[PDB]
């Protein structure tokens, strides 16, 4: 079973607890970490963050510790404009000049492979991202020639059936990369107002539409476009997402007038980390759709969708049950890395559920 986990960057310039480096992860919790978000400059890979060769040298350590450990970047990201990962990738030109880059810039930084995060490819995309894979794979194999292990390729694809159905080959380039991470977590729409959760594990048998919003169908979808089991990952998050409530009601699909207010290390509207949340519950009231099997709590005008030890261990189960390769679970900055928010004094309490779970058989 494979736990992949990520780290992202930016989560060193938190305040106080909420400071997060490379330095703070448990070596032996995870099988396979994430950097998060290398980045193009001139049709070339390159950092992000001034201190990134830093970083990377801090975290490609741990593997002093725990040999079996690798470790991966990633390209693309969210703050990475996906018009950019489609200008690279349409022209031949400008996408050899890219994978060619690649191989070196992990080689001297100690990376096992790079992780394709181009986030969400259009319609007019899905033929090149295929080239971009299957090519960028071909590069590696050429390159293991050299005598050396063969770099990891993998990629973090969208769970939204129309985000698939639009610009992904899946029956193609599952056959070229080594693993599939499935974004499960970013169901409930940005767009509309309303209470919902974002990372339902299951249908809910209670509303009709959209069934196509949840890990349940979203591996089922998969697995039929012909992703093989072995290669799949479904993704956790170790975060909530906030809501600023428009009206005393909390029950399902109540209003919403916007995001909820910042956590006071994270930051940013609409967005919890998991420890941050821990503090939140005290004096909220702790609610679970039965139908989906997640948690929401409400506390004032704020009310909180998001996943605890429990709801993460359901998954994981469901995860081992369809046979699927293992978890990936994002940033272990977001879960209770010190481990001293959560009231037990355990350190990465989300994660090692996921792992508890997958370790148990
Ligand atoms: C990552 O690389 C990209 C692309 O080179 C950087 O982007 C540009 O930066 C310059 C100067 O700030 C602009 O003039 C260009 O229009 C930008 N191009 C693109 C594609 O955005 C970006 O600055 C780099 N990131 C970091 C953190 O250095």
């Given at each position: 079973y494979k736990l992949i986990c990520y780290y992202t960057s930016?989560?060193?310039?938190?305040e106080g607890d909420g400071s997060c480096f490379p330095d703070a992860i448990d070596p032996f919790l995870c099988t396979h970490v994430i950097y998060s978000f290398a980045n193009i400059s001139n049709n070339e890979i390159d950092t992000w963050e001034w201190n990134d060769v830093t970083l990377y040298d801090t975290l490609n350590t741990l593997k002093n510790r725990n040999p079996k450990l690798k470790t991966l970047l990633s390209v693309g990201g969210w703050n990475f404009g996906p018009e950019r990962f489609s200008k690279i990738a349409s022209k031949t030109q400008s996408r050899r000049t890219f994978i060619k880059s690649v191989p070196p810039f992990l080689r001297t930084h100690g990376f096992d492979g790079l992780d394709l995060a181009w986030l969400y490819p259009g319609r007019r995309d899905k033929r090149h991202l295929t080239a971009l894979v299957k090519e960028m794979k071909a590069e590696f194999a050429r390159e293991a020639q050299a005598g050396t292990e063969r770099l990891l390729l993998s990629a973090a694809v969208s769970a939204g059936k129309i985000a698939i159905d639009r610009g992904y080959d899946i029956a193609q380039i599952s056959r070229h990369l080594d693993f599939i991470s499935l974004l499960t977590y970013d169901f409930h729409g940005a767009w509309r107002q309303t209470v919902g959760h974002h990372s339902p594990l299951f249908r809910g048998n209670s509303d009709a539409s959209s069934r196509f919003s949840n890990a349940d169908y979203a591996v089922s979808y998969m697995l039929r476009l012909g992703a093989p089991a072995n290669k799949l990952v479904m993704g956790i998050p170790t975060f909530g997402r906030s809501f600023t409530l428009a009206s005393s009601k909390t029950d399902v699909g109540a209003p919403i007038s916007g995001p909820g207010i910042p956590g006071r290390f994270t930051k940013e509207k609409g967005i919890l980390a998991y420890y941050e949340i821990c503090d939140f519950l005290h004096g909220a009231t702790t609610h679970r759709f039965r139908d989906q099997q997640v948690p929401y709590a409400t506390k004032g005008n704020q009310w909180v969708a998001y996943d605890d030890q429990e709801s993460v261990k359901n998954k994981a189960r469901y995860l081992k049950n369809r046979q699927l390769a293992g978890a990936m679970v994002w940033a272990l900055d977001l879960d209770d890395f010190r481990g001293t928010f959560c009231g037990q004094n355990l350190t990465f309490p989300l994660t090692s559920a996921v792992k508890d779970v997958l370790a148990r058989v």
């Open positions: 930016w989560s060193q310039y938190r």
